[PDB]
Amino acid sequence: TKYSESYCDVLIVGAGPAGLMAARVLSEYVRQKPDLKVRIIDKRSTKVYNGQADGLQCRTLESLKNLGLADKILSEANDMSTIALYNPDENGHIRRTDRIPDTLPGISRYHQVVLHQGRIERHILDSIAEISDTRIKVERPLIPEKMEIDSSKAEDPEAYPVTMTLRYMSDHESTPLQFGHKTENSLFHSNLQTQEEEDANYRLPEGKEAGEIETVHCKYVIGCDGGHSWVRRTLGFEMIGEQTDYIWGVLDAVPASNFPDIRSRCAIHSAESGSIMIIPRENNLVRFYVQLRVDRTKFTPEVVIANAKKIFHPYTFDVQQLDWFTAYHIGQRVTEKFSKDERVFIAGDACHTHSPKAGQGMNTSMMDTYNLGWKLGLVLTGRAKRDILKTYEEERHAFAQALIDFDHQFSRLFSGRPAKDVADEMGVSMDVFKEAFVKGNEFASGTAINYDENLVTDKKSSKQELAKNCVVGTRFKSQPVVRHSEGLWMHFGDRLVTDGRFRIIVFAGKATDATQMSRIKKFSAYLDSENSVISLYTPKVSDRNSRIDVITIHSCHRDDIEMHDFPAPALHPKWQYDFIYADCDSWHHPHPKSYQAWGVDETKGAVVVVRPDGYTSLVTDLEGTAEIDRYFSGILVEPKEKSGAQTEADWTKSTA
Amino acid sequence: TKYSESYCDVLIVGAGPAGLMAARVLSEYVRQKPDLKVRIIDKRSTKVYNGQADGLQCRTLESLKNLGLADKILSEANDMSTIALYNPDENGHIRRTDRIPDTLPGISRYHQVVLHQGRIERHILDSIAEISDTRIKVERPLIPEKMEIDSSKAEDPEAYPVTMTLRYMSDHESTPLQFGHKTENSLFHSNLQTQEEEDANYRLPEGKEAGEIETVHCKYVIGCDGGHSWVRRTLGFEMIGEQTDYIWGVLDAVPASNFPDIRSRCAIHSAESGSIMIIPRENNLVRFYVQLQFTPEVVIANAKKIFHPYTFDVQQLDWFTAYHIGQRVTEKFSKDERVFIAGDACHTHSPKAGQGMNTSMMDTYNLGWKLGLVLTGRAKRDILKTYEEERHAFAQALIDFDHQFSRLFSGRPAKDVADEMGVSMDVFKEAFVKGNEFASGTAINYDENLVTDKKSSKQELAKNCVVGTRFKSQPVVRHSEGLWMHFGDRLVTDGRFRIIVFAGKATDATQMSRIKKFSAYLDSENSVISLYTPKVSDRNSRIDVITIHSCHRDDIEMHDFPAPALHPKWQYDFIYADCDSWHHPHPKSYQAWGVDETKGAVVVVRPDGYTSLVTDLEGTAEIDRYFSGILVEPKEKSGAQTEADWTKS
């Protein structure tokens, strides 16, 4: 009945974790250039709880911290702390054989935590509201009906190569089934749903007046539409993998059990009834993953509870209150392609589906659009070349394959029967299981990713040895530093606010040394010069740390050198105190030995280039200014009016 | 005139930090007994929005944490970290001669932080609304005109001995602060901002008209009306002390300076122009206390002289004031234990160690729980005497400290070794370092009194848990999942007393015998748990019994401790361990608490977080006697524990 037409820079299809992270990242570029139009749609109402996830891993939290979202999430989430392993003994009774750390010591300053997905979303929704000044909001219930891509306009910055036809649904079309169960349940969301049903349930019924069918001309489209992604199926992107018939059930409940480790993360392998994974949650809840075509109507809590009782034998297990529940089969799926012309992208469950044994979904799916987001943002504001969009798929698809590989094995070890004795070859070795879990915990933290050389990751021009624990292509790891301004001891990763800027981390080394200070001054003379990356890439009369943020971490105690002993304003910006940090001893903490943790020489230092994303992309010395120019030349687009050579007088000397 | 009459349990005059903290603590007793009527009024139309008090010290933050208000505050406040001391050369040039820590290492897990008073107020206002489920609201602008006290009714529980006559003020009769609420650029609004903005409109409680005069019959009145207190003046309590001729100015600004330590806390003694104290704040602001010889320009001119030769300009100005160096304190804090005073109303001093808001909230944090327990029929009225016994001596020590410190800060630095009129910079440094212990608020030691029992304690069983001092937090490992945490986070301030059971080496058969015997006491018909928890109420709801043992959690289970006495049914915030964990070494917390690792001890902590009794597992008679002098037995006691051990099938 109503036919409409409009244009937009980005269309995000799906407002789950992936889609919302995409919106949150894009919001920053929308605030810098308010003409940009970024829309995000969902086809579901908010009346049926639409979520299922609860775990946030180490690198997700470091990233959320850089988006200003971690402290609010951390004030409510639960740190499970320990993984207690339970398996049958001589007589087949389950007992605790071991305990391993839920997060690996030293891997990150943030530990994995768990929290209701709806609270995670709310926090991301508030941030989007703030960063976009309420301008970007989820539109629902809306659903794409057609997608037409003109591959001949793909490299044209003025074109709108993707035409999306959206249908405005009815409240009833947008409401998912609940299969007759009283308890709020996300068996709709569940992966037992079929993509057929996913499309069939939100379909314009028969007595059918689409309320409105909108023709949206888009520069870019991001498909964050889940497991059965319609965006993926319409691009023709196959998905390799096959679903087992191992079936598990999920209970979010306030338990009433004598199980000694009911409040700890646990793995329970029973002799013959299946496994359980306990995920202790906030506010007295505990999540239970209980091992059990399937008729979802008959899939009740009761069936799941009866099976959990068998697995817990001889400990007791009862539910005091049940908030939600689901079911899922064990299966792994991945696509080979994440992009169609670097115009239509898929992210999140749309690209990779797997079991929840290591709670990786929401994590990986937000990290996908955290990666894509800054690349799209720089492209959209005219700051970076379109070729950086190829790095999305280059970096994230290999990661999804490694994710599916890890889940493939971990889910099967988790779902198999434990070996009775050593001769029982077709049982699961509990020692192999422990080994897989410990090894899986490094991968599952999200902190071990190493991106292969690409347009925004330059290994070839790097002297890696100058910063040995700052491996190009890996996340720039936070380490404690002492802010020079007042002596505040802090995690340096707090300083890397994600807002589209690249960083140049200047490890000034032993700045009191006359020879080292000569190198530092020469580097700052480069920075101040007419054609440095600072002068070239920061728009005329804009702040010189507004595109490329130049931060100095030195090796001296702050009693031995002043901030004004560093070049001003190249390294010591006028009346600004978030630029000079020190690897030294402080009132409440010992010398953190951060240069050493970063693998950098304490006397000579190094220069490390970090992406907007927080991933190290270049490692050189203070003399490697040509490698810095070349790195930025292949990525950034020069503003129409450049800042040019630094013309301000040293503010620390100047009399007023 | 419209006239009205009503009754209330507590009337709080003054909605500054003191009053708000009183409302916040009383809110909990109101939630437990919703008939209680607690009101809080104020003569200013709106809350403060800028400047004024800005310092939060260690013990305040520990307490705020126990009230669920520290993390919100910490997410915005600034930790000044260092104090840089500057004094003149031989040629009279100011230079940095030293740096000392802003918070003393090891003194607390919280460091002093700074954040203006409007933010604090916002936060205690939101807490109040949440705990009291919006029932307790600041009524403003209203002002008392008369107070009549009937001392012959002081000990009658049913009486309303204090009659307050209140007047509803009009928008234009209330005096607004010059640096008021500032609308936020943009369309986006968080709730702080939204709350801030409605708070910024004049607005009598509903139906009330400016001019309306209300006669309020009160059981209790708390005057938190500030340095010029109308309540203290009406009570006739003399503000004893002297006001010097030293005058200082204050600037809350975004500075434009080449001073190297502009973002650090600093003390600057200039040769002949006076002193400066720099207090580096949140969001690029810096607070400057500038000694004068009025408007902001006069204060800037003087700061330029003191900073010579460094530059000093103001990029933006958020607030400003001037005051005189002076100290004043009352001898009494209470009239019949019916009308109390708290905060600046009892003690005023210079802001050199930003003690005002800190001490004032600690006053009503102390008074509050005592009033709360009396009002809910849980404690006897005699505990109210301990407010004044504890807090007035502290106010006297505060004025004594400020008396000396403000004078050292406002004097001209000694040129020579012979310059005796001048201030010795070495004496100054000593005073500051020694002042920092006091100013943390963590060294208070209350004298023996009804709620603090030193005589019946065996202090040696817990040597760093000195009766009368705050029960210091120490890292522990929650046994349920192995979470490493500060144990003080567990002492939620909500009116409960704690019994901290240091179970010691629980795997020892002899030690477990003592533990079980203690738990048999707890479960017995006449224990403090059975006597003081109402029939069918949770047995940790009045006296909260927490167990901290010395074993690793791989060596003993939670269900090896008596259930439900020490291991409550399906509840996992009771058993903690002094052990090694995944991310931290063994904290050595028993040793930090000065408690024997094998034998343990039993420490009783007040609702307030102050230790009040130290004994051993056999000292059950001392525990009974301690609680019998304080608590009132409910009409229907819980009696002996009758639940089966829930851990056994």
Ligand SMILES: Cc1cc2nc3c(=O)[nH]c(=O)nc-3n(C[C@H](O)[C@H](O)[C@H](O)COP(=O)(O)OP(=O)(O)OC[C@H]3O[C@@H](n4cnc5c(N)ncnc54)[C@H](O)[C@@H]3O)c2cc1C
């Ligand atoms: C039981 C269970 C527990 C899990 N636990 C965890 C855990 O703790 N940690 C973790 O990281 N992961 C977990 N996962 C995985 C995680 O839930 C998903 O991987 C994650 O939600 C993927 O997010 P997404 O944004 O890509 O897609 P989804 O979360 O599926 O969201 C897609 C969104 O797009 C919408 N949509 C779909 N089709 C259309 C359309 N055609 N048009 C418009 N909108 C559309 C939706 O209605 C939906 O809001 C768990 C999964 C399950 C099954």
Ligand SMILES: Cc1cc2nc3c(=O)[nH]c(=O)nc-3n(C[C@H](O)[C@H](O)[C@H](O)COP(=O)(O)OP(=O)(O)OC[C@H]3O[C@@H](n4cnc5c(N)ncnc54)[C@H](O)[C@@H]3O)c2cc1C
């Ligand atoms: C103008 C000013 C400037 C200050 N500057 C500083 C500074 O630079 N540094 C520093 O550390 N501290 C400063 N303080 C001191 C500090 O703010 C207090 O120590 C702290 O707020 C604790 O005080 P209080 O709660 O007891 O009283 P206050 O904070 O004074 O609050 C008293 C409240 O009661 C009200 N009131 C007063 N009379 C009546 C009445 N008759 N009826 C009803 N309500 C009434 C007021 O409107 C006020 O809201 C300043 C205080 C003032 C008032």
